[PDB]
């Protein structure tokens, strides 16, 4: 389901040794940035990640769902990606 660009990208981060986050917004709370998360995914198994990453993307179909790489010692973010987009504009 996912594609290749999606699971290259949660590769390098978890490679790295990043945890993987998700936060999602439909298209009113898109304009003003305002984001909810995603259950976290504690989990640094590839096939897990991937597995629970799917789950916050099909429970949010048509909104926008941004992929997150999180440093864990400091909880910071060090990467954000959209993954997921309602394909109308």
Request: proline share 3%; charged share 25%.
């Given at each position: 389901?996912?594609?290749?660009?999606?699971?290259?990208?949660?590769?390098?981060?978890?490679?790295?040794?990043?945890?993987?986050?998700?936060?999602?917004?439909?298209?009113?709370?898109?304009?003003?940035?305002?984001?909810?998360?995603?259950?976290p995914?504690?989990?640094?198994?590839e096939?897990?990640?991937?597995?629970?990453?799917?789950?916050?993307?099909?429970?949010?179909?048509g909104?926008?769902?941004?992929?997150?790489?999180?440093?864990?010692?400091?909880?910071?973010?060090?990467?954000?990606?959209?993954?997921?987009?309602?394909?109308?504009?």
């Amino acid at each position: 389901f996912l594609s290749s660009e999606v699971i290259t990208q949660v590769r390098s981060l978890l490679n790295q040794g990043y945890r993987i986050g998700t936060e999602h917004a439909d298209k009113r709370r898109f304009r003003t940035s305002s984001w909810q998360p995603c259950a976290p995914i504690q989990s640094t198994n590839e096939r897990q990640v991937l597995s629970e990453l799917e789950n916050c993307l099909s429970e949010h179909e048509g909104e926008y769902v941004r992929l997150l790489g999180i440093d864990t010692n400091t909880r910071s973010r060090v990467f954000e990606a959209l993954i997921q987009r309602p394909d109308g504009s």
